[PDB]
Design a protein around this nucleic acid. Structure first.
Ligand SMILES: [Mg+2]
Lengths: 217, 100, 49, 105, 79, 224
RNA sequence: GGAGAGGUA
């Protein structure tokens, strides 16, 4: 009376590396909803992660302005910076410079390396330049965090997106171990920002959740 | 019982033949799942041939639609009863009122 | 009179109360109507057909 | 009348994909249905290539589709694509629908 | 799995002769001792024949060519 | 940061014989709903129960008959017996016996209990004998099971009567989250779980059971 | 097998 179907196999489908579809089965009736839901919340609600925090522009001190020689607008570049993805070691918060001139799409490689701080997506565009004689310099402060704070909670500032996941879903469905066909089967599709493989994110989340309730064994 | 009746329930129940409705108020002298006996009230009793009232209960019997029908007593020993009051709940009835 | 009777109980006079989902556990917005209803089971059984 | 693939179930009632109900004009107030099976190979191919549900989407009477989301899904969608004048989390900016989903969740 | 027949109809834009040609192929396959041309995935013969039609490597004309060729082979196999 | 306060079971308020409350604290933000929903589902889902399974009355052959002296149908007796509450200590299956004579009700207390089988509701009524020289004897079978099991789906003499199994102590589970009073921190949560069982289970034991169940189930995902 | 009565969508 203390025996339960531990899933086997644990199979996987590998869409492009930043996107996976894991299939687990056969689970005891009803456990699918609880397991899938909890993992979902943990993944997309609380997860360690550092993301950009705020920015300052050399020639702009107000968001409702415009710089010349830049194709886009302040809000657009701010959104791009929000879409940034970086990882940092023990250094909690860092500041980086993006001085550059000349016509061209200013992508992520243009930022100073600053050692341990690693940009995961160099191709990520940030803005464009329209006058070859135009320039742009800016200082960006990144800081570590867990969740997601909007701007209203608190020299420009940007919302922080600490969580690295992007999309998660699941659809429990029936299965049968040779009998007792009232059994379920979980299918988790996940798509991350690429800072870590989905399979590893699942292991991290499971570690967190399982460890939380340690005091009840 | 339906929580929200229209008040026409007891009429339909009693007027139908399913339930065993007392005919002369009295007292339960002995009850059983099968039968009932009532010591008749002194006044309702006829001058001659006193006797005492008795009822037998139709147990499980197939209905016209293959649905079993039987009756269950709804009173205990030493319970005074009055003329025209219900005694045995028939199918889909509760305390002498319709309950489907 | 229904309103008054309800208020005799401690139930919301509006009749609609908030609920929570079984699976997710989160609340449903848009307060929902609930109560009690008398229902019958008719004589058309699936096994018969 | 239409063809389908079968999926076994531990019940005694024929499940039915709800969208086709409009085509069948079939309420769930106790309407019954009848089942047939094609025996020979040619019958199976006829069914698959002509009578499969996925092949009949426009009414022959007129090019109008016949798989209209009937009554409930339509309500859900209409409720989804509405807008309160002042609701929680207004005026902000998002970097794609995925962020919208995450925010709402 | 097979859910549509649109590509097969594209290969053969009549939607009736499609059934007949597919049926003849699947009949060669099931009772006739023949083999498929596409890796099956534990699927029945009808869907397999339909997929063959889809890839275009089997149509009515090629079927006629093959039946005539094998008829000639059999007529040359009696000696 | 990157560290989370581990909740601890603070208090168990046995507000009534059956109604009970439990408190977990502290809890990092957002976890209250997670754990509450999970535990609610687990508790309502699976718990070892000890419902009755079979009956064997002396002078009857089938549940649709009647017995003289008793004023209720056999079906009524079986129905009432189905709602019985009891605990067993060591064995997974036991046979109780009931014998009774004389007039009056027949509480659960009328069972010749042993030191390992413990009734929880001694006053639970069964049937009303309506004749002094009318007795009933019966053998009850109690098994240890989980969840629901209809009599139809299981697996001998003509005297055995079979009932449906409902091995579950719990009946209603609710919970709330609320801010704690830690030395210095905000958005720190505290969970209160209100439960109402039939009375044959220790709440703390139930919580530990559910928690170990959940952890053991979850441990599959790690180290894939 | 055929009649008649009732009933469901
Ligand atoms: Mg209908």
């Amino acid at each position: 009376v203390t025996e339960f179907l531990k899933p086997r196999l644990v199979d996987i489908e590998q869409v492009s590396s930043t996107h996976a579809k894991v299939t687990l089965e056969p689970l005891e009736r009803g456990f699918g909803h609880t397991l899938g839901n909890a993992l979902r919340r943990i993944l997309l609600s609380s997860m360690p992660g550092c993301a950009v925090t705020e920015v300052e522009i050399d020639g702009v001190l107000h968001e409702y302005s415009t710089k010349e020689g830049v194709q886009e607008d302040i809000l657009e570049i701010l959104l791009n910076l929000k879409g940034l993805a970086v990882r940092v070691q023990g250094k909690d918060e860092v500041i980086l410079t993006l001085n550059k001139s000349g016509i061209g799409p200013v992508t992520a490689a243009d930022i100073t390396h600053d050692g341990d701080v690693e940009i995961v997506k160099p191709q990520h565009v940030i803005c464009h330049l329209t006058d070859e004689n135009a320039s742009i310099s800016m200082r960006i402060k990144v800081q570590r965090g867990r969740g997601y704070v909007p701007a209203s909670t608190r020299r420009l500032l940007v919302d922080a997106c600490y969580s690295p996941v992007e999309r998660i879903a699941y659809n429990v469905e029936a299965a049968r171990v040779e009998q007792r066909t009232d059994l379920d089967k979980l299918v988790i599709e996940m798509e991350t920002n690429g800072t870590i493989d989905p399979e590893e994110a699942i292991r991290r989340a499971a570690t967190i959740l399982a460890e939380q309730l340690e005091a009840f064994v | 019982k339906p929580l929200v009746g229209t008040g026409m329930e007891r009429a339909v129940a009693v007027d139908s033949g399913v339930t065993a409705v007392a005919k002369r108020g009295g007292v339960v002298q002995y009850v059983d799942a099968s039968r009932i006996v009532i010591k008749v009230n002194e006044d309702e009793m006829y001058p001659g041939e006193a006797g005492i009232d008795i009822y037998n209960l139709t147990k499980y019997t197939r209905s016209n639609q293959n649905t079993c029908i039987n009756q269950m007593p709804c009173v205990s020993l030493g319970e005074p009863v009055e003329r025209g009051d219900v005694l045995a709940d028939g199918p889909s009835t509760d305390l002498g009122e319709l309950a489907l | 009179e229904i309103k008054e009777l309800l208020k005799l109980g401690d139930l919301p006079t509006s009749g609609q109360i908030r609920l929570y989902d079984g699976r997710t556990g989160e609340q449903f917005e848009r307060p929902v109507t609930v109560g009690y209803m008398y229902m019958l089971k008719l004589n058309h059984l699936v096994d018969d057909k | 009348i239409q063809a389908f693939e079968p999926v076994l179930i531990e019940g005694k009632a024929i499940q039915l994909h709800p969208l086709v109900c409009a085509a069948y004009n079939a309420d769930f107030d106790g309407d019954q249905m009848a089942v047939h099976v094609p025996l020979t190979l040619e019958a199976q191919l006829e069914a698959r290539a002509l009578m499969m549900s996925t092949n009949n989407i426009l009414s022959p009477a007129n090019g109008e589709p016949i798989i209209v989301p009937s009554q409930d899904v339509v309500l859900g969608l209409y409720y989804m694509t509405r807008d309160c004048v002042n609701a929680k989390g207004e005026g902000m900016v998002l970097t794609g629908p995925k962020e919208a989903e995450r925010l709402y969740r | 799995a097979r859910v549509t027949v649109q590509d097969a109809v594209e290969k053969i834009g009549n939607r009736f002769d499609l059934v007949l040609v597919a049926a003849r192929r699947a009949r060669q396959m099931q009772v006739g001792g023949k083999d498929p041309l596409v890796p099956e995935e534990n699927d029945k013969t009808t869907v397999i024949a339909l997929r063959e039609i889809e890839e275009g490597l089997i149509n009515n004309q090629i079927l006629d060519v093959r039946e005539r060729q094998e008829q000639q082979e059999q007529e040359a196999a009696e000696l």
